[PDB]
Ligand binder design. Sequence first.
Ligand SMILES: Nc1ncnc2c1ncn2[C@@H]1O[C@H](COP(=O)(O)OP(=O)(O)O)[C@@H](O)[C@H]1O
Ligand SMILES: Nc1ncnc2c1ncn2[C@@H]1O[C@H](COP(=O)(O)OP(=O)(O)O)[C@@H](O)[C@H]1O
Lengths: 377, 377
Amino acid sequence: MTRIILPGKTIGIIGGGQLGRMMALAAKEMGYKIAVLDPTKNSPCAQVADIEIVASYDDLKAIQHLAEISDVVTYEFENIDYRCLQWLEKHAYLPQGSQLLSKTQNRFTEKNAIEKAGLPVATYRLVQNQEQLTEAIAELSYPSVLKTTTGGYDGKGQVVLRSEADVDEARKLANAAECILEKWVPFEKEVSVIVIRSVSGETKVFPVAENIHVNNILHESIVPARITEELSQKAIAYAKVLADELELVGTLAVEMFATADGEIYINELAPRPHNSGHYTQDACETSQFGQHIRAICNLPLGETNLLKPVVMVNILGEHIEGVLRQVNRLTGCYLHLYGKEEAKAQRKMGHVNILNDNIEVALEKAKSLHIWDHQEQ
Amino acid sequence: MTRIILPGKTIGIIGGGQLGRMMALAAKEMGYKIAVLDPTKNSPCAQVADIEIVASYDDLKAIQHLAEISDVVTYEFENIDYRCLQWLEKHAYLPQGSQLLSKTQNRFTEKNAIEKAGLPVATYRLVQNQEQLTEAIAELSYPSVLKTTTGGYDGKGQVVLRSEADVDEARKLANAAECILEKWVPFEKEVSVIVIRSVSGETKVFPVAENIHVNNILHESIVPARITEELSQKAIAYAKVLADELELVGTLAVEMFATADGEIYINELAPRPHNSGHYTQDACETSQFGQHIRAICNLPLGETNLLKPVVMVNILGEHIEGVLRQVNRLTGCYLHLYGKEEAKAQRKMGHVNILNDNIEVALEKAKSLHIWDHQEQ
Ligand SMILES: Nc1ncnc2c1ncn2[C@@H]1O[C@H](COP(=O)(O)OP(=O)(O)O)[C@@H](O)[C@H]1O
Ligand SMILES: Nc1ncnc2c1ncn2[C@@H]1O[C@H](COP(=O)(O)OP(=O)(O)O)[C@@H](O)[C@H]1O
């Protein structure tokens, strides 16, 4: 499309957490004005916004007020209900649309969409009752994973089935929610690729990141991912096909499992800037945030070249005190802090990008700081 | 010396122009709060700040207020009364001090300080009346340049004396303001170096940039500067010498003349982030703005490696319509706009950083856009 949102206009963001703040910082460099809607006052994004609307995400009047004063609307918060999404899509300017968001909100719908796009996923079965769970266990065997189809984004919303001894905890889960059961994928590495597609269809792909999770929370992203050139090219190709097939506008994070045998399976999609892309802020020619703004405003996309190898490390509530006390040791480290007040143990408070010519040296730097000893074990 | 301003604290900025705005954006990424004092409501920096104080720079009570709500204060406005800074360094925390600003604000005192350091400047004479102008011309001969000693570029401020035919114009200037006359330096290139020195003494220098001025306004900065390795090394050494001898805390921009025979003359010093350092936002590991914040807060400085060659081009009031009209054509270009509402022909509205593996391809890109046809002549 030809529709361009010029510098000087207002970008409205639904959700005022760190992803909102970082989008807003990127937009401000390019001379955009920012409006944000969020349930809590003084959110991370509001701390950088020109206009703040403090309301619930299901409050259609407030959503309308945001739209009314915005030249383009984007979201960080994903669980926007259909009546609000349709209103925005048809009566405001929401170039991302609602179709992609709706697909990624349900694990079953999501896997179907991926397979229909021609891409591999772990073999899976929908589980809506006990009978279906029984049949699924029979078909897929052990080991397996039962996950709820909606409302993550946790460790509680799933149960790993290694033996018949785990079935009872699984039945409990299938009793409270609609689920999916997936075959256990024996993977070597978890990897992700951020792809960007503008309103006019220009596409850019970021380099493959290797992701290390701990307690179902991201710990580290390592770029370049420590994988063969063949796995890398495959992950990138898969992401590009997804972006095309799903008619992406904006940002898509594609999380994947990579096997020793060089197989890729697609795990999940997030139609927004993602935690596994924060490395781009310091190590790439354009950040995922600068890219997202350009994409929705239909400006030319920037380059995604990796300019230096990087390890991103997450800063949770349990780490913030360690970071501040060790601040004098943060040479070659690039600190981002989100401006959150309460430091809950598993709340994401910031991240640090450790840049180095050698990836193993960056990894060692994080260890030597003794901030993440818990995650390291 | 050991004193550290931790992320989460409030940084106060005197002056709300583009330099304070970019300081503020970089500080926000680290989780700092920002206060700004500016005489005009909704200044570039206010659009990014948590707290805005609209008041004159000589309003001592507003200055005290800024001091009260801030954990550290810095300045962006280069023509601040040094008596205000004398108050701040004694009744608040101004790690930059008042000395450096007082020395660099007046061209004559500036020259004296550069010579005290042992570095070369163009031969110069103080001019307070017509008799002193006459004696200066007699002693220095032609060609020469007469410049006002204090901030008097809004614009004009200088007369180039190629022959006796220019003397009439110089007399006019000599009556209006205190001046110095300097010998014209026959240089092949103008270059600049940005040096950063933290509270605890840590010193970093950015790559040497080659600057192209049109009508005494910066037009392009070229990095790496197209000079010999030996000239780059000398420029870098001179910069460190100045930081050392001027007891620098914060940022110092050093503008220089490089002659055909490998000598460097120091033109002028600016005790702040400088227009010739804006390339660092997209081409270096740390920007001059992030480095300035880390310097005054006494955090470890970031690395200053050039990650990709770059041409920065200024966007003046005369250029902004052309930029907005040609946004479609800005591939490989990284646009920064300062949020100023009124365009005036020569007012600095933004800059664009053009990244390319080949510096000559970047330069051709700027020409092919035809936005700056007036400068290219
Ligand atoms: N089919 C599978 N095979 C092996 N490991 C899996 C499988 N599904 C999930 N996991 C593991 O569980 C973690 C969480 O799974 P995921 O579906 O990403 O849940 P969430 O949405 O909570 O992040 C993943 O990081 C992965 O290590
Ligand atoms: N002594 C000199 N010899 C040759 N060119 C000069 C000399 N002084 C200034 N110039 C030219 O004029 C420009 C403006 O002079 P400068 O002292 O930098 O004024 P300003 O403080 O307004 O930048 C310089 O960037 C340089 O190109």
